[PDB]
């Protein structure tokens, strides 16, 4: 039978967010009347776990599409990496034209918002977005830092691949999933929160 | 070939809305760094117990399980002003079952204020099946009942209440459902992104 893993990250006041900025904090705001109660969120786009699409995805009622956010992926263990990933790292996996990889990293066995996670490195970059994969998924809020210029999404983006960021996948063991990875309806957005599944075989 | 129904509302300002209220309506902010401010009852989503409850469950208490699996689509586009427990006695709905109704409101592009709801009757009908889950096309399952009964009998009966849902394009029958809401912590409702597959993935 099915396995269904979560590997979204909740959203309240308080959570990790990018570099610990206060202003990236979501604020709830609720309204009661009787047994009535109503509320607002104000979230930043790139909250928790979220996707990232090329600009050229989205701008009608334009949303992120779903043709490859929804089917099947590779999650990869690179738990053994230190720092960051780089092409040596990733060259020899089982890794194909179409593919959407996820990387489960050291960044899955921490849960607060940590400078050095580990990221995917320009050559890295380079050689997923020359492969035409169509999706990367990393368990860290960000994907790259301590590169000037945002190499690995610049890279990533030239090529059409959909950026996933912020995911969890401390419980999840390598193999092959069907992933089911939502982004909420906004239109006009490239970049959207995200509850992302995924199931058994 | 597997097809995946989408059969969620795009989110934009402007959108339909309850009552056409304009304090509803959501707002995107960039300061070029982007947010997205929005009523967690904002088009397609489920409600939280505490929505209608005083210190009820909130939205993280709803369990995932009960919103990825097999569902039942009906067509109700006959029924006129709202669905009575005559109109579906003679369903086959079980314990158990995720049912979803489709009515005229899926026909309808703006906000109606006489929409089709589900009654006190059905509700109770519902409750007492043990049903795990009921969607309907409106953006609120009740109107025109003082006390919000539909809502209560659900919620005392731990029925989950999907609203919103777009479902013009999809035929009658069985689907495989994975309704994914944004991971909110302690609220009383969230937005989801609900996807209906034809078979299981
Ligand atoms: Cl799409
Ligand atoms: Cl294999
Ligand atoms: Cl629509
Ligand atoms: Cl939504
Ligand atoms: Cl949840
Ligand atoms: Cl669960
Ligand atoms: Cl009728
Ligand atoms: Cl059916
Ligand atoms: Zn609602």
């Given at each position: 039978?099915?396995?269904?893993?979560?590997?979204?990250?909740?959203?309240?006041?308080?959570?990790?967010?990018?570099?610990?900025?206060?202003?990236?904090?979501?604020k709830?705001?609720?309204?009661?009347?009787?047994?009535?109660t109503?509320?607002?969120?104000?979230?930043?786009?790139?909250?928790?776990?979220?996707?990232?699409?090329?600009?050229?995805?989205?701008?009608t009622?334009?949303?992120?599409?779903?043709?490859?956010?929804?089917?099947?992926?590779?999650?990869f263990?690179?738990?053994?990496?230190?720092?960051?990933?780089?092409?040596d790292?990733?060259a020899?996996?089982?890794?194909?034209?179409g593919?959407?990889?996820?990387?489960?990293?050291?960044?899955?066995?921490?849960?607060?918002?940590?400078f050095?996670?580990?990221?995917?490195?320009?050559?890295?970059?380079r050689?997923?977005?020359?492969?035409?994969?169509?999706?990367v998924?990393?368990?860290?809020?960000?994907?790259?830092?301590a590169?000037?210029?945002?190499?690995?999404?610049?890279?990533?983006?030239?090529?059409?691949?959909i950026?996933?960021?912020?995911?969890?996948?401390?419980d999840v063991?390598e193999?092959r999933?069907?992933?089911?990875?939502?982004?909420?309806?906004?239109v006009?957005?490239?970049?959207?929160?995200?509850?992302?599944?995924?199931?058994?075989?």
């Amino acid at each position: 039978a099915m396995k269904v893993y979560d590997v979204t990250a909740p959203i309240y006041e308080g959570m990790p967010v990018y570099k610990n900025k206060p202003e990236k904090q979501p604020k709830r705001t609720t309204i009661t009347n009787g047994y009535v109660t109503e509320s607002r969120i104000d979230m930043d786009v790139h909250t928790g776990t979220h996707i990232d699409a090329p600009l050229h995805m989205v701008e009608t009622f334009e949303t992120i599409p779903l043709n490859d956010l929804v089917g099947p992926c590779k999650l990869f263990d690179l738990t053994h990496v230190n720092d960051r990933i780089t092409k040596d790292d990733i060259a020899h996996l089982d890794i194909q034209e179409g593919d959407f990889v996820l990387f489960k990293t050291k960044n899955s066995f921490e849960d607060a918002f940590h400078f050095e996670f580990i990221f995917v490195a320009e050559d890295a970059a380079r050689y997923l977005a020359d492969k035409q994969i169509r999706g990367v998924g990393i368990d860290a809020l960000g994907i790259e830092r301590a590169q000037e210029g945002h190499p690995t999404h610049k890279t990533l983006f030239s090529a059409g691949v959909i950026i996933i960021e912020g995911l969890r996948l401390k419980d999840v063991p390598e193999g092959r999933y069907f992933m089911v990875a939502a982004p909420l309806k906004l239109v006009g957005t490239d970049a959207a929160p995200a509850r992302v599944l995924l199931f058994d075989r």
